[PDB]
Every structure is written in C-alpha cells, then in structure tokens.
Design an enzyme around this catalytic site. Structure first.
Site, PDB file in Angstrom:
ATOM      1  N   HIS A 177       8.514  -9.329   1.231  1.00 57.40           N
ATOM      2  CA  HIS A 177       7.304  -8.959   0.491  1.00 57.40           C
ATOM      3  C   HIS A 177       6.257  -8.391   1.447  1.00 57.40           C
ATOM      4  CE1 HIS A 177       3.876  -9.607  -2.474  1.00 57.40           C
ATOM      5  NE2 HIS A 177       3.164  -9.693  -1.363  1.00 57.40           N
ATOM      6  N   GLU A 178       6.000  -9.095   2.544  1.00 51.30           N
ATOM      7  CA  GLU A 178       4.998  -8.652   3.506  1.00 51.30           C
ATOM      8  C   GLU A 178       5.334  -7.327   4.155  1.00 51.30           C
ATOM      9  OE1 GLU A 178       2.124  -9.926   3.338  1.00 51.30           O
ATOM     10  OE2 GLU A 178       2.728 -11.732   2.272  1.00 51.30           O
ATOM     11  N   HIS A 181       4.009  -4.424   2.270  1.00 53.66           N
ATOM     12  CA  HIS A 181       2.631  -4.010   2.520  1.00 53.66           C
ATOM     13  C   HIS A 181       2.580  -3.201   3.805  1.00 53.66           C
ATOM     14  CE1 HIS A 181       1.147  -6.505  -0.717  1.00 53.66           C
ATOM     15  NE2 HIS A 181       1.401  -7.675  -0.154  1.00 53.66           N
ATOM     16  N   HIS A 187       0.367  -4.810  -4.560  1.00 55.79           N
ATOM     17  CA  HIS A 187       0.932  -5.817  -5.440  1.00 55.79           C
ATOM     18  C   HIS A 187       1.245  -5.194  -6.797  1.00 55.79           C
ATOM     19  CE1 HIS A 187      -0.678  -9.417  -2.942  1.00 55.79           C
ATOM     20  NE2 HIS A 187       0.591  -9.195  -2.637  1.00 55.79           N
TER      21      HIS A 187
HETATM   22 ZN   LIG Z   1       1.424  -9.416  -0.980  1.00 49.62          ZN
END
Ligand SMILES: [Zn+2]
Ligand SMILES: [Ca+2]
Ligand SMILES: [Ca+2]
Ligand SMILES: [Ca+2]
Ligand SMILES: [Ca+2]
Ligand SMILES: [Zn+2]
Ligand SMILES: [Zn+2]
Ligand SMILES: [Zn+2]
EC number: 3.4.24.17
Lengths: 226, 226
Positions: A177-178, A181, A187
């Site tokens: 997930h990170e 970014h 998101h």
């Molecule tokens: Zn996030």
C-alpha cells in the site's frame, strides 16, 4: 478524537455545520452511511488501524511531483524492525515491489548504500518529519509522493507488531500500500482496493491481488507493461 | 567538533586522509589558509555563528527546484519572537525582501492566512524537520530552496537574542541571507557577500548593500529588473 481525525485525514479547518459536512465527506469516502452524525458504526471506523496519509489529498508539506520521470527506480532498506528476521523483511518488501512491477513498465533495483529513490525505514513517535507516529494501533505507516529527497520514502511505525502472517500487522500488505503512494497513488474509496486507507486483515494471503481500480490507477500514470 | 562540522557543512563521509582533504576544502571556501591542519585560526572559525545550510551544496532531504517558476511570490510570518515587538519583526522581514526585489523582477505579497510560498517562523531545537536547532550560538537559521510545501521556508533559531540593531543577532541581516536560499542561492566564498555562511556583525547597517556577487548570482536565475 473525531475532530483531529477529520483534521488529519480530511483537512478540516485547523482553526456544528462544517464538521457535519466533513463527517459526511468521510462517510462517503469510507463506505459508511452518509448521515452526518457520530453513529456507532462511524465512531468504530475511526478506531481502526489505517494509513497516515490523508484521504482527501496529499501531504501538504511534501507534495512532490505527480509521477516519476523515469521508469527505473532504486530502493534501499535503511533499518530493520526487530520483530522479524532480516530476510523476512527483505522478502516482504521485495514481494510488495513485485506487485507493482507486474502491471507497469517499472523496475526496482536494491541499493545497500547511498541515496536511493525510495528509502524504507522503521521509526517510532517523532522521527524527524512533521508527522510523528502514535504508538501501537491507529496510524500504521505513511509514505510520500514521488520526487527528490524525502519524497518517495516509506516509513513504518515500529510500535506495531509486524508479522509474516496475519497474527499481527502484515508487513507485506502495508508495504504494498505504501509503495503505492511512493509511486504517485492516492487513497481509493473502493473497499476491495489495496489503496483503501484502512488495513484489511485478510484471511488468505494467496488470494491477494491488486483490484482493477489499483491497476487502472497505476497504469494511468506509467502505462501498461510492454 | 571539527568532525561533525565537516559532516554537516561539507558532506564528509557520514560513516586522517579524507578529513585533511575536507579541512582543506573548508579552508579554501571560508577564506582561510589552505594547510590541512587544525590551526588556531581554523578551530576559531568553527565556533563562529553561521547559517545552518551546507557550504558544498543544498539540503539533501529537500532539494527543491533551481528557481521559482513564477515571479510573483507570497510570504507569510507564521509566528513571532518575543525578543522584538511585532512591528520590528515585520519591518525586518519586509526590508530583507526589498533587498532582493530591487535587483530582480520579483515581487512579494504578504499573506496573513493560508499557504504562502515562503513561510517564515521561529523555532528552537527540534522543530519538525530533520535539522534541529542547537541553542544559542552556532547555527542561527536555515532556509530551503524553491519548491512546493516546506521548500522556500525560512526558520530562525529563537534561542538567539534577535535585535533591531547589532547588540545581538540582527534579524534583518540573517533574514536577508536566508531569503537568498529561499530564492535559489547557495553559499558564496566571498567574504563581503551576503551569501557568505558566517554572520558578519557589521558596524553600520546604512552601509549595507548586496555585493556584485550576490547581484550576479540572483540575476543569473531571474534576470535583471525590467
Ligand atoms: Zn495510504
Ligand atoms: Ca526519496
Ligand atoms: Ca501506530
Ligand atoms: Ca513553501
Ligand atoms: Ca543556534
Ligand atoms: Zn515519517
Ligand atoms: Zn546560508
Ligand atoms: Zn527548520
């Protein structure tokens, strides 16, 4: 609680009407019922572990750039968490990067010294940036959008019990997930998307895969694999 | 002392031969005698108050961009130092910006709320970024190169005794130097240049002016006034 939650994740006036509006924006985004009141279900969602990056945007202090201006990126694991053996962290991070390599023309090479594009590190509480961690629970990690210096980096709260399986906080899932970014993604409001802000303690890690939303989002920036 | 001084201002290997080389690079840059030994004059220069920004480069964590992509910038004074009356700080900052407006096509408008391009603030010790201040003396302030978010901002160590005259640390002089970094300038090796890293407690503030080096440096980025 709800005040700072809306301040931190939905940039509510840092300095009632405006609050109910934000409560509703949050409910629409997180898949709850758009009422405007602090329901039992709403107060609960706010106690759930999540990513520290805001839902309506990017980190204001380090916006970065929309996407990397190159397809060949480097990464480096600065330090490790004692919760796991060094090789388990290395694998978790490698598998997390692999998820994104698969659907894009991007490549990742590991550096063991020097300044890499994406620096991964574990920290607790105040760690040099403007967003200190908060002990166990709540914020699990945070990452910065593409760019030079600190941008692109991913920080993991070492006050969490990081695991290889799902008995604690799965490092692989959070790292994947990170990294999202770190590559330029925001998101998503889709509950089955990896980019959804809340941690999904899923049963079978083998049944793990990027949802079409994740794929569409990442491919709209770098394109599909050649 | 000398070790961290070379580490912080001359990016000496963070992890003798290499040290003597750095001692020499420092001596060449600061106008000392290029020997390579810790002379009395050398150990003294290292105790003098200076700017926190490195001499051989930029802040690695927030490189920013070479110059602003616009000529009309905004600034905002986030907080104040109790050492001076609010109007004295305002004047000091305005006169510091005026110095640069005079030799370029740049303009500065003050904002009292919101996100401005250049945010000015006073802080002590750890203040959210990776470079904590160090109490009275030594590092006086630091600023970041052009760019979004934290880039362009100027921080002043509130552990210094800021003054309107030269009985302490002149806010005007330091602010003028720091704004220089905010606009894209690096430190200069010229002793009479405002961009020289060490604070010059000069006698007559009326005899103050940018040296040709400062002017040439700033005009090579934004051009001359129309
Ligand atoms: Zn996030
Ligand atoms: Ca980076
Ligand atoms: Ca936490
Ligand atoms: Ca700024
Ligand atoms: Ca100081
Ligand atoms: Zn962090
Ligand atoms: Zn400086
Ligand atoms: Zn600072």
């Amino acid at each position: 609680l709800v005040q700072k939650y809306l301040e931190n994740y939905y940039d509510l006036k840092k300095d009632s009407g405006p609050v109910v509006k934000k409560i509703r924006e949050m409910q629409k985004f997180l898949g709850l019922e758009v009422t405007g009141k602090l329901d039992s279900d709403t107060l609960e969602v706010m106690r759930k572990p999540r990513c520290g990056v805001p839902d309506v945007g990017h980190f204001r202090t380090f916006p970065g750039i929309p996407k990397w201006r190159k397809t060949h990126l480097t990464y480096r694991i600065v330090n490790y968490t004692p919760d796991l053996p060094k090789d388990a962290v290395d694998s978790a991070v490698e598998k997390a990067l692999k998820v994104w390599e698969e659907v894009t023309p991007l490549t990742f090479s590991r550096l063991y010294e020097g300044e890499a594009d994406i620096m991964i590190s574990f920290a607790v509480r105040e760690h040099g940036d403007f967003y200190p961690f908060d002990g166990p629970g709540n914020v699990l990690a945070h990452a910065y959008a593409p760019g030079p210096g600190i941008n692109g980096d991913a920080h993991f709260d070492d006050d969490e019990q990081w695991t290889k399986d799902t008995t604690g906080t799965n490092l692989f899932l959070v790292a994947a997930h990170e990294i999202g970014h770190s590559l330029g993604l925001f998101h998503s409001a889709n509950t089955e998307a990896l980019m959804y802000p809340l941690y999904h303690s899923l049963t079978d890690l083998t049944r793990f895969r990027l949802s079409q939303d994740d794929i569409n989002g990442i491919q709209s920036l770098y394109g599909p694999p050649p």
